[PDB]
Subunit: 82 residues, 3 copies
């Protein structure tokens, strides 16, 4: 059954051929992936949404300050009879 062995070998060669192709693809895919060492994880970062919320709170405080200052400027104008 030498011909039978020859058939099993060709089957094996085709399996290997497709595996080698899949490995070539995999290696390329892996090179497009980010390393753990080069990135930060979610626990280490604020999102845009979170930063926006923090910034909006600062804006609010600044606007309250601007209103206070404007009131003071008019209080001064009143004191100066001006």
């Amino acid at each position: 059954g030498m011909k039978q062995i020859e058939m099993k070998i060709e089957e094996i060669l085709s399996k290997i051929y497709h595996i080698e192709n899949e490995i070539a693809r995999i290696k390329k895919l892996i090179n497009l992936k980010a390393n753990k060492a080069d990135v930060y994880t979610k626990d280490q970062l604020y999102t845009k949404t979170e930063i926006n919320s923090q910034m909006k709170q600062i804006e609010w405080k600044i606007e309250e300050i601007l209103s206070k200052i404007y009131h003071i400027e008019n209080e001064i104008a009143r004191i100066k009879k001006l």
Copy 2:
């Protein structure tokens, strides 16, 4: 030694079987990994700790301003004899 060849073939088939299984696993693993193109690296980002430090400095400045404004309001009250 046809039986001997048959043994080597079965050994090879089992090696291939396990390789194919490992490749299937790998492909699934890879699909769960983040692409370099979709993420920022550490050099491009501030952490929560860094943002917190920056925000705390802004808070400090705002509190110094609020204290200045409160002093000015009382200076005005004193000028008004009020």
Copy 3:
């Protein structure tokens, strides 16, 4: 042609040997890659450059406020003839 079969088998064994080595390497590489589940993507994050721009705008507003307050302090000094 038993010797011919023996040659094809050794060729196959060497192909498998190198594949197994490449798979071992791949598995190690994959373990160094970041998971999608553990990271944020670009659309979800501000970069250092963007945060710096936002912070610089806050600094600008704070400096404008400090200048306003300094002017008011001197207006008060003038009112007090002091």
